[PDB]
Amino acid sequence: SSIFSPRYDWRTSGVHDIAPRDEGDFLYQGPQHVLPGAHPLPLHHPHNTITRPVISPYIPSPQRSHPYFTAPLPELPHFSTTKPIVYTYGTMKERIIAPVFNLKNEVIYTRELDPFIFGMYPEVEELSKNLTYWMVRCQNFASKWDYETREIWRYTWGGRTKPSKPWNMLMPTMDVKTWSKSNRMMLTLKMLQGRLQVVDRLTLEEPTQECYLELCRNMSWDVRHTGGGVLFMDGGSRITPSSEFDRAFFFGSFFNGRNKIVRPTVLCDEQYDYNKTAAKQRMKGPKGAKNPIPINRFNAYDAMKHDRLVITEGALMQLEDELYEHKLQILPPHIRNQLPEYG
């Protein structure tokens, strides 16, 4: 029951068995005893490194601003960002370099990220806006139908006066500004938690599923339902980026486990509403934006539900090219008047 309620503690005995188990129960030795799961901070998800492996140069520590590198390693080829780096109002104000991986679980080289894309420090308000929009859009609006008194023909059988209706339900409209902001903040949150992995290509030797499973096993990708899921952003590679997905990998990624491939973009189309005043009566579907966001986009809900985030260098290049003009327009005038000067 409620905490401040008399019905909260009237079960004063019997909830526990006096005799303990002989296989799993044990006694508390003392302060030097390490209890399984004990932690001072409230962790509703007590996942640790071994259970949920993080892939990053360093374990995220309070001393380090971000768990990735801060300077290019002299023993690895360094690849600068495709578009020049600008630090905006929300950027981390620090250089970020990710150790790109190969399909053989080996670090190939190190590629610099973008602080505007992977440096926008996350914020709970925007993350919650994204999550709420996604969870209110993904619900099925065609199943919200209910009877009415004029629809019931001869109280119990007589329907309600104002029942729920597919058209009466609401589908909200979200602006591309907040959408891109929330997606960038989610990418930065993944980077800070240290579960972002950059691969050169996502290509299978055969379009079947056993080759996909063999690839995941070789590079230690946990795909099971119970284990930590995977979120792919396939875009091709660095030299040959493609907006569409690779055909072989797109055919092979259909596994029952927790793995989802999404389109390599963080923006969205501007949602329109041509039935704002309920002009067309025979329209079926919820009021609001008639052009919702498809499922194969990057989103806070799927990013939280899937443990690891594997982005491709083609996706990186496409995101940078799509956010270049935005991060250039956001700049104040006394800064943007110097862009042609610096080149």
Partner: peptide
């Protein structure tokens, strides 16, 4: 009469025949 509230479906005749 509010005819615009309804959609265009023919209601079943009452009483229904066998």
């Amino acid at each position: 009469w509010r005819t615009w509230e309804y959609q265009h479906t023919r209601p079943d005749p009452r009483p229904f025949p066998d």
